[PDB]
Design a protein around this ligand. Structure first.
Ligand SMILES: Cc1ccc(-c2cc3c(N[C@H](Cc4ccccc4)P(=O)(O)O)ncnc3s2)cc1Cl
Ligand SMILES: Cc1ccc(-c2cc3c(N[C@H](Cc4ccccc4)P(=O)(O)O)ncnc3s2)cc1Cl
Ligand SMILES: Cc1ccc(-c2cc3c(N[C@H](Cc4ccccc4)P(=O)(O)O)ncnc3s2)cc1Cl
Ligand SMILES: Cc1ccc(-c2cc3c(N[C@H](Cc4ccccc4)P(=O)(O)O)ncnc3s2)cc1Cl
Lengths: 343, 343
């Protein structure tokens, strides 16, 4: 993996990301305590994922820029903008975990659940967002793509927040209503909440850093990447339930949490009224036998089969989209991602 | 008041602020529900203050720009950037109210306390922030000061978030510790949490909109405005306790809430160890006789007197700062504000 390789240089750079964000203690003694706190927030919430989103910025930059324009300072900025994507994701996660009342994240006590943090985690999350724009000013203010990157991050923020709204309206935890759980609505949530920031944002960042600022180029890439994003989340939802937990790295609570998961959406498109009721009974309760009872119903409606067929059709559709819309980017940009997620 | 006058045209523009932020329903049917929710958030959280911060943008614009360059579209943008300041403040308030566990804001149930909102208010607050940048793109993307305004709003956000951090570290509600309640520390909290966004931001916005982008100009104005901000909050703290409630428009809970208020800071600079204890006893409890007991101790240390002297010294200092640092802005820019707050 072009990823496996650059992962070292990416995580080492984090040390510097922090040094700089905390350098204004030398500036202003007054605010030191606050900066100490900011250090703690970064160290706890930005480390511990697989850094797929961040690395994608660096990998795409290497693939998009003639090697002659890849000097030490250019790579410094690719590293930094990748970290900016991870910090956006960290901001969303800290805040999503408060709102969902989640207990663990990346197999670790969620930040807001730590002794002496609680709802202070809201300000903490706001700082994480701020840090994106601090890094962009510190590393990219002199660059011709500076404004392009600010607009991208801000738009990405807005698209995600919109998705979060739509989700919260659709799945009030403590309110088992399946009538709002439709394909149209599932697709929209994924597009706004996950797909823009996870697939479009990091590639679009690399494109601007490479002098590829054209609206048609970005539209074309967007068409490919939002569809990759759709498949990714659908696979996320399949494997929450049917995923081997030692393989995935997690055990799925989507059923207990009354999620608008691809699985229930398909289940509802297929059920007879008898079956609608068994689900209406069991979907969104914590009881292990009322959760075995949905899994069994999913199984009896051969949804693992429905998924395998969707995974085949989806693979064909992505490859056609890459043929049509990749040019004049190296198809490798897209193919590298398509291989991480169809793995 | 140059304020009393333009207040009409400001509040009427809000209707349009909303129309535009909700116009992408025509764009995207999919996200309609979310946009409905966004409308509700704006209507509830942006309306109902005195719009001092927003109006200051409009008033300062009129005073700074030769009347020949004040066309219909220029005033549209002044209105919009004023609303952007109010939306920043609304974002901070919705989030601060969750973190403080406050029950009412502008004599109204805090948003997060409304049936069916709760911690969803966190995403709501994020949308309010987003809306700033949407409005700036929609009204100012073609203008030469566009980037200047994005950087200002983002920096203002960061300064405020830092202040919030410092405050939360200093005043853990449920932790009566008075040793961290020092003048140095009180001053820092005010500067970062209140003064930048409330005094510097709206004037600095008007300055950029007027082609006044120079670093020395902005430094000079900042020197005046951060000191106005310091006095404002000190008066806020005095009147929380000694303010006539029918005059102010609020009854003060600073004592119950273990706030780092100017009052306790002065109280601590003055108390004998006997008095340190009576306070250490009574500061931060909800009991009306352990709150009468602090008020009485403040009184016995003649703090209303200490304030009156501070208000005189502060007035002299601001007027000297305006003589020195106003040029080449119309001193009226500063004097109009100085009169709203020394009222
Ligand atoms: C843009 C992009 C986004 C995500 C990925 C991948 C993520 C991920 C993963 N992620 C874990 C979550 C997850 C588990 C199982 C299935 C999907 C996601 P985690 O790193 O702990 O969040 N676990 C196994 N494989 C993968 S591939 C790859 C790309 Cl190119
Ligand atoms: C860009 C790209 C995309 C996909 C692949 C391959 C994926 C895959 C696979 N994937 C399994 C699932 C799958 C079944 C059918 C069609 C695609 C994926 P899994 O390991 O469970 O994700 N199982 C056998 N063979 C393959 S080859 C290879 C590349 Cl170069
Ligand atoms: C930049 C700036 C910021 C604030 C003000 C003023 C605010 C305010 C007020 N505000 C109320 C709060 C407040 C009450 C008493 C004393 C200070 C503030 P509220 O509008 O409900 O937040 N109540 C009486 N007078 C005032 S003057 C003026 C400016 Cl020129
Ligand atoms: C720019 C400017 C600033 C201040 C003033 C004035 C304020 C004030 C006052 N203020 C009272 C308090 C005060 C006492 C001493 C010095 C300044 C303010 P209050 O209404 O309680 O805020 N009480 C009598 N007279 C005055 S004149 C006038 C302007 Cl043209």
């Amino acid at each position: 993996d072009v990823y496996a390789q650059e992962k070292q240089d990416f995580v080492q750079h984090f040390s510097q990301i922090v040094r700089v964000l905390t350098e204004d203690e030398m500036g202003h003694p007054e605010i030191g305590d606050a900066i100490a706190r900011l250090k703690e927030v970064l160290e706890y919430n930005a480390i511990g994922g697989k850094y797929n989103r961040g690395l994608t910025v660096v990998v795409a930059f290497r693939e998009l820029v003639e090697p002659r324009k890849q000097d030490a300072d250019s790579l410094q900025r690719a590293w930094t903008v990748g970290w900016c994507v991870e910090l956006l994701q960290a901001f969303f996660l800290v805040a999503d975990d408060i709102m969902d009342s989640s207990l663990t994240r990346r197999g670790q006590i969620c930040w807001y659940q730590k002794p002496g943090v609680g709802l202070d985690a809201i300000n903490d999350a706001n700082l994480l967002e701020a840090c994106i724009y601090r890094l962009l000013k510190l590393y990219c203010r002199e660059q011709p793509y500076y404004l392009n990157l600010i607009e991208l991050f801000l738009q990405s923020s807005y698209q995600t927040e919109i998705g979060q709204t739509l989700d919260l309206l659709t799945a009030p935890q403590g309110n088992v209503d399946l009538v709002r759980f439709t394909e149209k609505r599932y697709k929209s949530i994924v597009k706004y909440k996950t797909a823009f920031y996870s697939f479009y944002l990091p590639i679009a960042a690399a494109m601007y850093m490479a002098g590829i600022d054209g609206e048609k180029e970005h539209a074309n890439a967007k068409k490919i990447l939002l569809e990759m994003g759709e498949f990714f989340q659908i696979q996320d939802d399949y494997l929450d339930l049917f995923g081997d937990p030692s393989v995935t790295g997690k055990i799925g609570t989507d059923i207990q949490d009354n999620k608008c998961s691809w699985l229930v959406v398909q289940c509802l498109q297929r059920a007879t009224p008898e079956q609608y009721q068994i689900l209406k009974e069991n979907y969104g309760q914590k009881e292990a036998e009322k959760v075995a009872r949905v899994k069994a119903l999913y199984e009896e409606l051969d949804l693992p089969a429905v998924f395998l067929q969707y995974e085949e059709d989806s693979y064909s559709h992505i490859m056609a989209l890459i043929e049509q819309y990749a040019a004049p980017l190296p198809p490798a940009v897209f193919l590298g991602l398509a291989r991480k997620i169809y793995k």
